[PDB]
Amino acid sequence: SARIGEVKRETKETNVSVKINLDGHGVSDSSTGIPFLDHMLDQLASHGLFDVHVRATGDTHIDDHHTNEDVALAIGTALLKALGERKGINRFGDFTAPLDEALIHVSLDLSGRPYLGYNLEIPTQRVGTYDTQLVEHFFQSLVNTSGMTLHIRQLAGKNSHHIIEATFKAFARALRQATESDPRR
Amino acid sequence: SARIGEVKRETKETNVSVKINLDGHGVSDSSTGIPFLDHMLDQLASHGLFDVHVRATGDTHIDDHHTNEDVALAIGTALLKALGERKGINRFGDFTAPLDEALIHVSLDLSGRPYLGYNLEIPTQRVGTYDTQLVEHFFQSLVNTSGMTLHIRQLAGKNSHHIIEATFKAFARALRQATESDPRR
Amino acid sequence: SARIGEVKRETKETNVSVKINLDGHGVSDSSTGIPFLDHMLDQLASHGLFDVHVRATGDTHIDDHHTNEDVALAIGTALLKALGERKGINRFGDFTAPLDEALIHVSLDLSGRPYLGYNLEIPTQRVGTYDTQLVEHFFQSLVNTSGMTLHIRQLAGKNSHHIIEATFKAFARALRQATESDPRR
Amino acid sequence: SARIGEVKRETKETNVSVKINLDGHGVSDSSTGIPFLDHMLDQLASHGLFDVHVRATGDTHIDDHHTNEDVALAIGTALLKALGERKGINRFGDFTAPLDEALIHVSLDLSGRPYLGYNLEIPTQRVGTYDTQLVEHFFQSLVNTSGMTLHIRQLAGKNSHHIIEATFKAFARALRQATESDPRR
Amino acid sequence: SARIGEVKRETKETNVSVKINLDGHGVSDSSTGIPFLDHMLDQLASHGLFDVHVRATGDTHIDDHHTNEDVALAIGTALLKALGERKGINRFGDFTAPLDEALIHVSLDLSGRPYLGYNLEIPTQRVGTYDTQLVEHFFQSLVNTSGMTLHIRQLAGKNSHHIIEATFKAFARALRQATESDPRR
Amino acid sequence: SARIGEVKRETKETNVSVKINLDGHGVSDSSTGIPFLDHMLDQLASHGLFDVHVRATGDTHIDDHHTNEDVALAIGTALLKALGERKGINRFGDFTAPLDEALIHVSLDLSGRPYLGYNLEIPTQRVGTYDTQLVEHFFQSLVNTSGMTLHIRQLAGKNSHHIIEATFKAFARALRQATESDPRR
Ligand SMILES: [Mn+2]
Ligand SMILES: [Mn+2]
Ligand SMILES: [Mn+2]
Ligand SMILES: [Mn+2]
Ligand SMILES: [Mn+2]
Ligand SMILES: [Mn+2]
Ligand SMILES: [Mn+2]
Ligand SMILES: [Mn+2]
Ligand SMILES: [Mn+2]
Ligand SMILES: [Mn+2]
Ligand SMILES: [Mn+2]
Ligand SMILES: [Mn+2]
Ligand SMILES: [Mn+2]
Ligand code: NA
Ligand code: NA
Ligand code: NA
Ligand code: NA
Ligand code: NA
Ligand code: NA
């Protein structure tokens, strides 16, 4: 039976609905009001073979910060719920993905202890309309509600969109690994 | 009886109305034409337990500078009027507020001698559409019309929205302390 | 009615029982198998006016690490439970406590978002038999389950016991402030 | 019943009489033969809400050193006497006070163990006729007879009169906090 | 017989009309499609007492560059035409203007030989939607068609809007002096 | 006819009377209890062609600080009063004055927004009995009550009396310029 986590979260600032299938086929269906984040969430589905359904509405006239954070928090919680008792899984994931000149190493453990190690150096302040400080906030928030240990290490990269997208490819692949069944467990 | 200060400031550039209640319940009612400043004025009301009413429009087609300044000047005057003869109050306020990784120490004295000490280092140029140079200008202008001695010291912080918002939290709580009754005066 | 949180948690490594009263009288009843940690828990009770009850049976023949961690995790959860809906509280706490030459500033927010900022430099590796690396882990683990934003800043200090104990005094006092009723809320 | 400490002390060099009320109304009555010190003692009364009565005569034809020291020693003893058994008090005090561009953080504990941490950098040698080295000596001597743990930290300042006066404001306010009743003890 | 210069110039990128009266009363009537430039041209009128009429229709969907340049070229030519044979004028101008923290020294000679000396350091990339690289280009183009020797020296300044606007105030006042009659010539 | 501003102000520390005529003939009538300040106020009258009447008494046995500050505050208020609506004036003033080896550039704007930029480096602590820190405090306090934008820049100088006196000559001549009628307004 497919492992599915669903979360509805309403704050003063944002309304968020998430549904994630750990055992999906890469179905991407994300609409957050933040086009660059939607693009990254599509990468998450396609490279992780998760089914990702996200809806958010919020106060983007202020900036994208509150929406970014609330989506990430909800996603972490959805992952936690989908994982259930975590029986018979690999638990650890490790992958290095390129995107042209960018190269990003992600290592993670579905440990129940939140930690983010992050060293990206994104050389521009905006990719499209997306504030590049929000990348770290997205992963930190996801970590805090999922309880995962996550290390994100930039090995190479110059183009901001390549650095971020390569990070999502590596994260998706590492998370696929961690959530898959270990054949000897 | 509640201490309420009301100010109309009209310049070539901006039309401003402010009403502040020092003895409020955190009623937030601010519309400046600058969404991020509206968000910070909400934080002022919420964290300081002030009632804050602001209406402004101006030449935002140029940039946010003139409106940001005229709003700040009028708030400073409003505070001055609300304080009246300052009988029986703490006068001094001192608070350090975190917001995640950010940590800001604000110390103030309702002295009648304007001074701004400010050392924030905001690492991005825009939060949403808000020019981060305007944060210092907001506090300088407020100080100049209120006659407040104000020091703002950045102890930690990386996210620009966090640093600015922690500053308003700390300022609001320090100002609440300073405007409150001293039980021995 | 007093705000009391109780946690019983057993792992492969440790068997822990914690009960904390936020509205206590400083009743101290901590026995962890780690004498220096018991001394610090006593400081928490006495300086915070919490009633603190801790029992732990752990694998200290290996080292104190698993016991220290499991105690801290359970305390964080106990605090979370005791706080309930967090209605009407100060929420923020800020205190700087000396102990002779040592001086430690603690600032915290009962935010629901875990974060530890810690900069202690403890110049010796052992205080009695207690590994001084475990101080940071204690606070990190406590933050992670309580969901608090916590900043610990060393302003002065040379004696390791003084540095660590001053940190617990300042923490206890900042947490007492945060958990107390705000008379205007 | 008001907590009052009285000291008479005669040395080869000076004759000093001190009376301090911890529970006063800011009555300032200091005549030491050192006008700048009188001015600082007035600040201590007004900002601390102590009643301060001081008389000293001595060998100021030599310099102000012996008088300054003997006044400080007597005040320390007077505080210790007034404190009595220290039942039910806050014991710790912490305050940061501005005076224009100056900003001074004082932290203290009524511990019974004397310690002075002092880092003021006063950039002129005389304020009026008062030797600026005597500021440190005043606080050191006070600490030695009171048994106080006292930390004085300069955060900002350029004007010598401002730096010293802000220190006395912050000290008076921290000391008031420490000597006041803790409502839960 | 006011000295009036008029230029109508159309390129494949822009269509521009400028009319300047050296002997004006500050009448400001500038619409370029670049709101910040219009604000600066208003400053030129107000502080210089020129009558300034500008209209431009340009390709601002690309960026403000071609419009900014073509407006500046046309203003330079209009000044040249207005000056005519330059009989009896001061010819040199020199003014230092503050705007809050900003302080800008402008020195010019209506010499017939184009030169721009410019050392502004504008610390942000955008003021509103206005690219701050365009300030130097405005003055360079103006110099090139007018044939003036112009030095712009930043003595102080932190806020980009203040730096640029002070530059325009100082330029306008220096140009007013240079274009005015020398009573002895 | 003549623009005259009068201010009487008494505090616990000082008693001050100021009368200034902006349209004077350099009548000098200053007695502050601080002989070097008297001499500088004489320079203000003679170089500015202001009529300057000042009387002050106060606690100079403590030091000259309170007197210096209260005189400057009163002067600033008196200038503000005398200026009235500020109709038809130059508003800006700019002058560089030598005194032997000293050279001081003063630039100011009668703007309504207080700002002091000050970089004097006065190499001795006392000129006669006058504490050289008081020069800066004089100008800061004057700016604060007058609402002027004032920049004081040391270009050269070694002798402390010369540096200070040149500053007052330049300030006086700049203020004369700013307060004089613009013949085209
Ligand atoms: Mn956030
Ligand atoms: Mn892409
Ligand atoms: Mn401005
Ligand atoms: Mn926010
Ligand atoms: Mn282990
Ligand atoms: Mn561990
Ligand atoms: Mn101990
Ligand atoms: Mn001695
Ligand atoms: Mn004083
Ligand atoms: Mn082009
Ligand atoms: Mn070009
Ligand atoms: Mn402007
Ligand atoms: Mn002062
Ligand atoms: Na398996
Ligand atoms: Na009161
Ligand atoms: Na409450
Ligand atoms: Na008590
Ligand atoms: Na002429
Ligand atoms: Na005029």
Author numbering:
A (entry chain G), B (entry chain H), C (entry chain C), D (entry chain A), E (entry chain E), F (entry chain D): 9 to 193
What wording appears in the published article?
Imidazoleglycerol-phosphate dehydratase (IGPD) catalyzes the Mn(II)-dependent dehydration of imidazoleglycerol phosphate (IGP) to 3-(1H-imidazol-4-yl)-2-oxopropyl dihydrogen phosphate during biosynthesis of histidine. The metalloenzyme imidazoleglycerol-phosphate dehydratase (IGPD) (EC 4.2.1.19) has been identified as a potential herbicide target due to its essential role in histidine biosynthesis (Ames, 1957; Hilton et al., 1965).
The holoenzyme has an open conformation where the C-terminal region (R193–R206, termed the C loop), which contains a number of conserved residues, is disordered.
